[PDB]
């Protein structure tokens, strides 16, 4: 449905949390196509 993590060591879009915690978020998944986003 959305962009999770499904399996402990599957997709991992961390790269994008990451990115998005650094600015003083704490989302960060793929989107429908499958682009970095960030959430609240």
């Given amino acids: 449905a959305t962009c ?3 399996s402990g060591t ?3 879009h ?3 949390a990451a990115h998005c ?3 003083g978020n704490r ?3 793929c989107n429908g196509k ?6 609240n």
């Avoid at 499958?34 to 959430?39: A, E, M, N, P, S």
């Fill in 34 to 39: 499958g682009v970095c986003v960030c959430r």
């Fill in 21 to 23: 915690l650094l600015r």
């Fill in 14 to 16: 961390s790269a994008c």
């Fill in 27 to 29: 989302g960060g998944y």
């Fill in 4 to 6: 999770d993590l499904l």
């Fill in 10 to 12: 599957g997709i991992n």
